[PDB]
Design a protein around this ligand. Structure first.
Ligand code: NAG
Lengths: 49, 48
């Protein structure tokens, strides 16, 4: 390659990464962090512990 | 696709035979790996 600072668009070096997942073949091990709320007591609420 | 291992350790005073007693086995570990196992082996520590 001939990457030079004087080069314009279409020639400056770019860093590119492609991310790939799997679809329903194995039990999951890498997932987004599920958000959490705080804890209330002595009140009729609904929970998802 | 889950490999479950349960374990227990128990000191014994009898020499050879299995004891006449009851004791549950608490769970130890689960592994989320899918392998279609059908046979297995054992490992020994010999003196070389
Ligand atoms: C069980 O064996 C078959 C082939 O006989 C294979 O296609 C399958 O993936 C195996 N199951 C597991 C859980 O590895």
């Amino acid at each position: 390659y001939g990457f030079q600072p004087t080069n314009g668009v279409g020639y400056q070096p770019y860093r590119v990464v492609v991310l790939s997942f799997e679809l329903l073949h194995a039990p999951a091990t890498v997932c987004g962090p599920k958000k959490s709320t705080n804890l209330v007591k002595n009140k009729c609420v609904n929970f998802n512990f | 696709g889950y490999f479950k291992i349960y374990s227990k350790h128990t000191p014994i005073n009898l020499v050879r035979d299995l004891p006449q007693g009851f004791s549950a086995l608490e769970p130890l570990v689960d592994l989320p790996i899918g392998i279609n196992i059908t046979r297995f082996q054992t490992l020994l520590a010999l003196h070389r």
